[PDB]
Amino acid sequence: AISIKTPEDIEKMRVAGRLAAEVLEMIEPYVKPGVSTGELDRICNDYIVNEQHAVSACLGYHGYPKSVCISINEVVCHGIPDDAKLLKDGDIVNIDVTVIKDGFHGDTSKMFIVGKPTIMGERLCRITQESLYLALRMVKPGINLREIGAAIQKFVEAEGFSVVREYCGHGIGQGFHEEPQVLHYDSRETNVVLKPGMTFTIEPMVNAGKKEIRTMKDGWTVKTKDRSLSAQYEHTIVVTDNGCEILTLRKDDTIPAIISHDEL
Ligand SMILES: [Co+2]
Ligand SMILES: [Co+2]
Ligand code: NA
């Protein structure tokens, strides 16, 4: 079932989350034209291991071969870091990180724009981030997860993009992927009432084009069927007594760490 974390668990999650966000703040500078995805994966790994003294949860997860997922342009998710894949001007890149510290996990990701941006690229990252923020703003005890999925979808579609169906956010803590499944669209099957103490991620994958995807020969890389661009953002949060607390907040986030719902 869904696990309610205790205050102490939360404190642990706060540490794992901060570490995860840090990695994202740390790698920004190195994200530029000409750099390979493999080198970025190496930098993150070393940082996590040697500086943070933590562990990457992705490395070996169901056989995942690298430390972080780096998805470029049309890649939807699970892009495999590789030394032959170089960053170019105009690319939109997602870097997804999961760190373990003391047994608790912190999962987060962001988009980066390489060099000069395209109108659509920049626009797609912005609506994708807005769609995550919107969801975050909704979280409070008593709401149903279905309303969140519905809201994201409606928003995204009203802006002319699509939400990927196959991939969802998830409960998280001692376990990388715990209940519940957090769908980013409306589904009559969804029925979970939020309680304080619940910890989970929200990580909408948005396509500028059609919602369909395809998985490559590699068994990991997922791409849009129509070759359109795809973007995603993700945060880890805890449901509080009157709202939520964002455990993976970074300095460039423009949403506050704690969201209090005065209507409560
Ligand atoms: Co996740
Ligand atoms: Co992630
Ligand atoms: Na992408």
From Swiss-Prot:
GO terms for molecular function: initiator methionyl aminopeptidase activity; metal ion binding; metalloaminopeptidase activity. A divalent metal cation 2 binds at D107, H170, E203, E234. SUPFAM superfamilies: Creatinase/aminopeptidase. It catalyses: Release of N-terminal amino acids, preferentially methionine, from peptides and arylamides. Binds 2 divalent metal cations per subunit. Has a high-affinity and a low affinity metal-binding site. The true nature of the physiological cofactor is under debate. The enzyme is active with cobalt, zinc, manganese or divalent iron ions. Most likely, methionine aminopeptidases function as mononuclear Fe(2+)-metalloproteases under physiological conditions, and the catalytically relevant metal-binding site has been assigned to the histidine-containing high-affinity site. Its EC number is 3.4.11.18. Substrate binds at H78, H177. One of its GO terms (biological process) is proteolysis. Pfam families: Peptidase_M24. A divalent metal cation 1 binds at D96, D107, E234. One of its GO terms (cellular component) is cytosol. Belongs to the peptidase M24A family. Methionine aminopeptidase type 1 subfamily. NCBIfam families: met_pdase_I. This is Methionine aminopeptidase. It comes from Escherichia coli O157:H7. The lineage of its organism: Bacteria, Pseudomonadati, Pseudomonadota, Gammaproteobacteria, Enterobacterales. The gene is map.
